[PDB]
Structures are given as C-alpha cells and as structure tokens.
Enzyme design. Sequence first.
Site, short mmCIF file in Angstrom:
data_model
loop_
_atom_site.label_atom_id
_atom_site.label_comp_id
_atom_site.label_asym_id
_atom_site.label_seq_id
_atom_site.Cartn_x
_atom_site.Cartn_y
_atom_site.Cartn_z
N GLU A 80 -5.34 13.86 3.81
CA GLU A 80 -4.17 13.71 2.97
C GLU A 80 -4.30 14.73 1.86
O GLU A 80 -5.40 15.00 1.38
CB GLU A 80 -4.10 12.30 2.39
CG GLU A 80 -4.21 11.20 3.42
CD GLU A 80 -4.66 9.89 2.80
OE1 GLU A 80 -5.41 9.95 1.80
OE2 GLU A 80 -4.29 8.82 3.34
N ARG A 99 0.82 -1.21 0.00
CA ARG A 99 0.00 0.00 0.00
C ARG A 99 0.86 1.26 0.00
O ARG A 99 2.07 1.20 0.21
CB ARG A 99 -0.99 0.01 1.18
CG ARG A 99 -2.20 -0.88 0.97
CD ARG A 99 -3.48 -0.26 1.46
NE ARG A 99 -3.88 0.87 0.62
CZ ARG A 99 -4.79 1.77 0.98
NH1 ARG A 99 -5.39 1.68 2.15
NH2 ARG A 99 -5.09 2.77 0.16
N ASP A 128 -4.78 -0.81 8.30
CA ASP A 128 -3.89 0.34 8.62
C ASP A 128 -3.13 0.21 9.93
O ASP A 128 -3.11 1.13 10.75
CB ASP A 128 -4.68 1.63 8.58
CG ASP A 128 -5.43 1.79 7.27
OD1 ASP A 128 -4.85 1.52 6.21
OD2 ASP A 128 -6.60 2.22 7.31
N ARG A 188 -7.68 15.77 -0.18
CA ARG A 188 -8.69 14.73 -0.05
C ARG A 188 -9.73 15.19 0.94
O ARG A 188 -9.40 15.61 2.06
CB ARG A 188 -8.05 13.41 0.42
CG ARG A 188 -9.04 12.45 1.06
CD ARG A 188 -8.41 11.09 1.30
NE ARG A 188 -9.29 10.21 2.04
CZ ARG A 188 -8.98 8.96 2.41
NH1 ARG A 188 -7.78 8.47 2.11
NH2 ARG A 188 -9.84 8.22 3.10
C1 LIG Z 1 -2.16 6.46 9.36
C2 LIG Z 1 -3.33 5.81 8.61
O1 LIG Z 1 -4.21 5.21 9.23
N1 LIG Z 1 -3.29 5.97 7.28
C3 LIG Z 1 -4.35 5.43 6.39
C4 LIG Z 1 -5.44 6.50 6.15
C5 LIG Z 1 -6.16 6.98 7.41
O2 LIG Z 1 -6.67 5.85 8.13
C6 LIG Z 1 -7.32 7.94 7.06
O3 LIG Z 1 -6.82 8.97 6.18
C7 LIG Z 1 -7.97 8.50 8.32
O4 LIG Z 1 -9.22 9.12 8.03
O5 LIG Z 1 -6.51 6.07 5.26
C8 LIG Z 1 -6.17 5.26 4.21
C9 LIG Z 1 -7.29 4.91 3.21
O6 LIG Z 1 -6.99 4.14 2.29
O7 LIG Z 1 -8.43 5.43 3.36
C10 LIG Z 1 -4.88 4.73 4.06
C11 LIG Z 1 -3.75 5.11 5.04
O8 LIG Z 1 -2.67 4.16 5.11
#
Ligand SMILES: CC(=O)N[C@H]1[C@H]([C@H](O)[C@H](O)CO)OC(C(=O)O)=C[C@@H]1O
EC number: 3.2.1.18
Lengths: 470, 470
Positions: free
Chosen positions: A326, A26, A51, A342
């Site tokens: 993000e 991922r 995650d 996002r």
């Molecule tokens: C640190 C972490 O958890 N990162 C994860 C992130 C997060 O859970 C979310 O942005 C919180 O809202 O989400 C996703 C996702 O594919 O949706 C992948 C990331 O690897």
Amino acid sequence: ALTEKTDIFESGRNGNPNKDGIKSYRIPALLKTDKGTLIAGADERRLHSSDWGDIGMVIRRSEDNGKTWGDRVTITNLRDNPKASDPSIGSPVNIDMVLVQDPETKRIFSIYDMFPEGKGIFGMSSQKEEAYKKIDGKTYQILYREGEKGAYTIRENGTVYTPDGKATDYRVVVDPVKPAYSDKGDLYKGDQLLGNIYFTTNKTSPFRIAKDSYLWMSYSDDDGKTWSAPQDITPMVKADWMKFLGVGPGTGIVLRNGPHKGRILIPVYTTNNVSHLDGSQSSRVIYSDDHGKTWHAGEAVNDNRQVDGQKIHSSTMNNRRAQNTESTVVQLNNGDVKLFMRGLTGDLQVATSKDGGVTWEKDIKRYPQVKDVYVQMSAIHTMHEGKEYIILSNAGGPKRENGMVHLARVEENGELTWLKHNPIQKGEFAYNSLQELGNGEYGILYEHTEKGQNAYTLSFRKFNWEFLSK
Amino acid sequence: ALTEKTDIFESGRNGNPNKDGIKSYRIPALLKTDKGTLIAGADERRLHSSDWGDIGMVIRRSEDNGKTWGDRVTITNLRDNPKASDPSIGSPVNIDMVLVQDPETKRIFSIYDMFPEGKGIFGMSSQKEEAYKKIDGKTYQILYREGEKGAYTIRENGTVYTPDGKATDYRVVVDPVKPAYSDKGDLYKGDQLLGNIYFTTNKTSPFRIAKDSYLWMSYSDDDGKTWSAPQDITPMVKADWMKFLGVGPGTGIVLRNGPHKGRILIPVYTTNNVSHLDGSQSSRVIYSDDHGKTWHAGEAVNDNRQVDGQKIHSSTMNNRRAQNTESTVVQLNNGDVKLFMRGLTGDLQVATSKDGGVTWEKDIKRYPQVKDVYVQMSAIHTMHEGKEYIILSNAGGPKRENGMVHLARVEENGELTWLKHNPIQKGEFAYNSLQELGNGEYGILYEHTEKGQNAYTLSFRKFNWEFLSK
Ligand SMILES: CC(=O)N[C@H]1[C@H]([C@H](O)[C@H](O)CO)OC(C(=O)O)=C[C@@H]1O
Ligand SMILES: CC(=O)N[C@H]1[C@H]([C@H](O)[C@H](O)CO)OC(C(=O)O)=C[C@@H]1O
Ligand SMILES: [Cl-]
Ligand SMILES: [Cl-]
C-alpha cells in the site's frame, strides 16, 4: 490547535457487534469535495475484523467541515451466500477503497477490491483461472460450469453464452437495481433466481466467475449522496501474470501541473505467482487521462529495479525486503510524483516518477526521520504562505500505535526535508487519511481503539498550522 | 519396401568439424511442396551439438523426390559476438524450426526460436525484462542502455528513441542485407558500426534487447530457393507471463476441412516463471487465419486441465509429470485436431481439439502401445484405400535408439488403434520428420549417428505401404 476526536464509524465492543450489528470498521478514506463536503469512507466489516467476510463499502458526508455527519450511504454490499457453512468466510468480498474527485467533471470515484466468496487475499488459489475472454474485439467475463472445462461468457444484456458461442437461457444481473447493488452477479434462468456467480461453495446455480482478484469502481455525480453501480475495471489494468491486484487504500490525487495535468492517480499493488504475499508485493499506480472512463496500469517501482546488485521485476521477484505494498501518492510543484510506500525496512520508503506516475526512478529514498512499522499511511501536498510542504501521517510505533503527523519541506529538486513530527493520538493507531480543509486547517480520519473497542473505530480530528509547527 | 539412408546433412566425426567447418546438425524438418519439391530443414550447429551457440537455419532442396539434393540454402544466421570470451556460448542463437506451406498462396514458412547471445533456454534469467512497448498503438522492441533503467525503443527505420521519446542518432539494422541476414541487429551511430543489440557480453555498443525467448519467421515465395529477412512474431503470440516460448520442431499443417479450413497450425510450447523447465513445459499451437500475416496463440493443453484431483494452468503449474513439450499436429477427416506431445509418462500422450486448435478437450489420451522415451516425434495424416490412418515416428528405446514407424487406424470415433510398429533405423535415433510423398510412398528425415559421427547426421529414407504392414 487540535480538536477532540469525533468517532465517525463506531465498532462493537469486547468481540461483539455494535448496535447496528457490525463488529468492525476498517480502512478510512477522507475526501474534500469541490462543494467543501467531507466524505469519509470505510470498510463496514459486519462479522469480524479480518480481511474477508461480509463487507460493505460505506461513506458518511459532513456538509459542515467535520462538525456533524449525515447517515451512512452504502456504495456496494454484495449479498452473502445463504448456503455457506461458515458465514465468516461465506460472502463475496469487497475490501479497501480509494476516493478521488475529478476537479473538472466533479465526478467522485470509489475504487475498491473484489473477490468471490472466501478469504480474499488469503484464499487465492495456487493456479490461475482465466477471468476474461476477447471475442470479436469485445472482452467478456468468463463463467465456469461445474463439471465442464470450457469457458462460458457473459455477453450483451448479461446473457450467458456456451464455450462454443451459443446463447443459453441463463442470464447474469449485470445491471443491479437493489439497494447497495446486492443483486449484482445474481444468476437467473428466465425470471427464476438460481444463485449467484460470486458464490463458490454449496452453490445452487451452475455458474461461477474465475477465482481471482478483481478491481471495481463506483462513482458519484451528486457529492457522494448516490452512487453508480459497480464498474469492473480489472481487464483494463490487470496483466495476465498478476495474481493479486488491489488498491493502496485512502485518497487518490489528480495531477495539477506539468504535461500530464488532469491525470487521476490511484495507488495499487500486485503480487505474482512466483512468491505471492511472501516476496512479491509491489506498488504502482493505475491512472486515467480521460476523467475516469478508461484506466491504465503504470509500471511498478520494482520493475527493472536494482536490488543487492541484481535487477528484479514485479512479475518475477521473490524478495521479502524489496517489497512495497500500500502506498500514498503526491505530486510536487516541480511536477515530480512521490510514492510513499508501506514496506519492511523500519523506515519510510519513497519512489519518484518524472513522467506522471508511469515509470519510476532507479533509487527508492529511505528516510530514517520517519518510522514505518509496516502499516498504511497517507500524505498530502500543502501550500503554507507560498512555501511548499508535505504532511504525512502514520503510526509512530513500536507497533500499530502512537499516531504521528509528519511535516516535510519540499526542496526545489523534490528532496524532502523533515521538519516536525507531532503525536496526534495515544494508544492504538493504524490506517489513516489526511485532507486539506482550506484555511491552514487539516482533517484526518484514522483507525483507533479504546475502552474495549474492536479493531477499529474510525475517528476524525481537525488541526491547524499551530499544531504542525509544534 | 524401405530404401537405404541418404545422408542429407552430415556432421563431423570424432568431435571434429566436417569439411564445411560444421560439427553438428540437429532438428530435422521435412516439407513436400506444391511443386513436388522436398525441403529438408535443419539446425546447422557449427561449434558443438548443444542447444545454443552459433547455429544457422538451413535447408536443402530435392527436385527428384529425395534422390539428389542441392546446395545448402541458409535462411538465417546471426553473426557471432567477436568479443565473447567463450565462443561456444558467444553467439545470438536461432534454434528449432517448423516448416509449413500455405497451399493457397504457395508461401513457405520457417518458424524458429531466437535468443540473444548465451545458452538459449538453459541460459534464461530468473527475472523478467520487458521486451516490447506499445507506444500510441504501435509495438516497438525495447532496448536497454548500460547503466540506465529506462526503456529505449527501436522505431521506424531502426531509429533508436530515448525512454522519454526523442530520436537519437543510434540506428538498428531492421532491414538486413547481408547473406543469411547476419547484419540483423547491428547497432550504428551514424555511419559507424558499433556492435549488435543481440550481444550480451563484452559489448562494443551501448544497447541490447531484453534477455528473453523470441519467435521468428522467414518465408519463401520461390519454392525454398530464397527467403525473406526474419520477421519477429513474438509480440503477436507471447503473453506477459510466458518465460520460454518456442516451436515443437518438424512440419506444421494447414487444416484441410471444417470451418477453420486454411488455418495454419504450428506446434509450440511454453514455460512459466513458477517452475520453468522443472514443472511447466506446456504444449499448444499458434495459428494464422490470414496466410501467415498475423499469428495468434491457442490455449495450452494444460490450461484448466484436471491433474491429480486439481485444476492446473500453463502459467502457474509446477508439475513434472503433467508437462507436455514438443508436439506434432494432425487434422482428422472429421475436423478434430490431434496433438501428439513429448512427455514423461514413458508412453504416447495425445490431446484433441474440436475447435481447430484453439482449445483442448479435458482428457489426454495415453497409448501404452507406443513408447515415448522423452524425445521429439512426428506424425502425419494418410489415406489408404480408402481408410483413414496416422503414421507416427520416434525412438523405440530404451534410450534415443531403434527408430520406429508406428501405424494407427483412425476410428469412426476419432479414436486411434495402433496396428503396426516397424523398426526403420537401428542404433542412434532421435528427432524426425515425416512426409507423404504420393503414390503410396512416404519420406522420413531423421537424426542418426554411426562410425564416430557427431550428434547428429540427418538422413532420408523412403518407404511404402508394405513396409508399414509388416
Ligand atoms: C485486500 C486485503 O487483504 N487488504 C488488507 C491488507 C493486506 O492483507 C496486506 O496489505 C497484504 O500483505 O492488510 C491490511 C493490514 O491491516 O495489514 C489491511 C487490508 O484491509
Ligand atoms: C530451444 C531448445 O533448447 N530446443 C531443444 C530442446 C529443449 O532443450 C527441451 O525441450 C527443453 O526441455 O531439446 C532437445 C533434445 O534433444 O532434447 C533439442 C532442442 O534443440
Ligand atoms: Cl450459486
Ligand atoms: Cl554490442
């Protein structure tokens, strides 16, 4: 125009581990170095696609612009808790990276999240645990001992001091030496290994770090071949009110023009203790003006933002729809910084900073021409024949599917005129990371599954301007 | 044994102002100075009895151990907003003071809360507004301009700077000269007075400070006769997560023994943004190790406190019964610090610090012998031939009524044994402040009403050991 996909990190099938014993890959990050090398980074998710768990930060290098790829270099992989009852949550976690190269020192940075053993962002406690203590102008990481209220500290050489400031016979491995730095946090008494400060259950040692969200950095001075030990950058950037603070995965930028030229930008996002993941996710950047030695937090897009006729702050907000998480960052020729975030509006949200990413303008621009299904994206600056553009890739929808590559003309005032929207991958499409390759060619590392692949296999494709104009 | 009350600050009668135009006096502080002077401090609540409005920080001095008292001296009184729709809430607020003298320098300090115009602690916004900015190692107070997102700053000589760092021709009065410093915060454009940065409604100037809770200090070097202009000590002690931060009013101490001897201790309490006044009020002390020049926040009693099976923190807690609020501080002969804290258990709660008020031991001691009706109390250290005691005063209840003076022996253990419980005032009884007067005599200043008097009239009594022994 567009090449076939080359799988770079291959996931297992039908719920099983691949041949290396890894179920999942991922979170792609794609970096084009000064040598011309392609560095592809990923979460190596050994036990499952979720995650958390046992995850290594891994890269592979292409010394031929994406044609062939070397072997996996593991940047960081913390060892699991051998005594955890549930191995799927039985490891200290590294998760989500951002890559960037300093174009002057040539140093390559990997910035990624760190949690102690448990469920990552999904296992955070409701109550704050102080993580650091400043003593005589020095900041030390705290340790908690079972049954004791007081904050132990990790001081010089890794030596553990009592709450009342006396040296103990315990030390922490603060200078890890093992491959992937898997010895980091190991707790010794003399030369007897007792356990690890990142373990949270069924512990064999008396000490643990605060159960919190951390931000680590590793760097390479040899084009991604070898990597430094993890550097804890948390106390430089994490305010006392922040709950979560983690990267917006992908590839960061170095500012190329204007007063803040040379500034390294790393997208991140926070949550707060009022509403955490339900109402407070807020984009911002951290930055370095001294080539990555010291790090500073910019303000949030959400800080003093007017929402439904009322001012919010990233530290106090409780507004699901006003979140931004993000993000991907680009600097324009006029010197503006754009932050593509996002979010939860259905369409593309964009913030603008006039001061090199420190503060943001009052409005977030929403672009109905570009769909956002609440998933990571990347965006890069590109000059084609002296005209200024931005390429942005994300899923076309309705779900995490149909990879779209978008083209915008950037106007002189920093406005974005969307020109073309071009499919690049049918079926499953999630996280992705774009780069300029140096002709009129562009590379893209992305998440896709086919033929029973576990989420996700990460694949690479090249494309030129002929594909963009389509 | 117990003298008749001498009225020190008299409130109006039957909802009307008194002769001086003052409806109400609240929040007594009593200080015996090195010269033998008694300083009686109070909130002078002009318009009504509530925890906001137009309030001056005032004192009277007695040069004959409480027999006669001089004229009111006004420490600080911020001018009201003349354009406010409701004058009852139409004034920048100062509320609740702690008095203390530095025994070395003889400097007398008054530390007290500040809010901009509004309802004080009951008028705080749900969203944080950044209040200070560190620009190049210097801390400046932020200003907000109508219809703009950016943070203006108040810099050298009160010159207002733009968000982007340019001097304007707006100026803030940062060195007030009017009686009671009523000009502080005045906003000038050149020669022209436009308004005040503490005004929040119907503003005549473009600038205001962040809507937040502040902590101010004024000092006297002539035995209480004259006072410095207010010093804004907020940024030294207020962490980013903190919502309210204000004093536990009464009289602070200077530690007389141990390695922290000379340290000045001031009781304070905070709320957080998770639960504010519903579940987060948390006692602590701030302290100065350089004779009042710089200030530091200690840790909360509630930080890493185990409550009902689980660890809480002052920054994140939401637990009504776990709150501790205004408090009074006492150092024992053995070096330990006791903090007696207003709370919601119906009885006396006491915390102990072994490091001069920086951190607190794991258990709060409850004493069923002393009722706490959820109202301020005061407590002092005293010696009696030559056994160690603590005298504490508060309402006996059922409500804020039947004033009591309680007497405990300080055991060789640091434990307390409650020996005596002596009524000192029938009828209404609320806040109070104790002082040792010398030669086996004690003074108390306290809130009481009778004969239609508005809440409250502040009256003074003296008593000796035989009063205590009953
Ligand atoms: C640190 C972490 O958890 N990162 C994860 C992130 C997060 O859970 C979310 O942005 C919180 O809202 O989400 C996703 C996702 O594919 O949706 C992948 C990331 O690897
Ligand atoms: C700053 C302020 O408001 N101080 C007030 C305080 C406070 O409101 C309470 O502690 C909140 O819980 O209460 C009281 C009171 O007689 O109860 C008097 C103080 O003047
Ligand atoms: Cl362990
Ligand atoms: Cl004004």
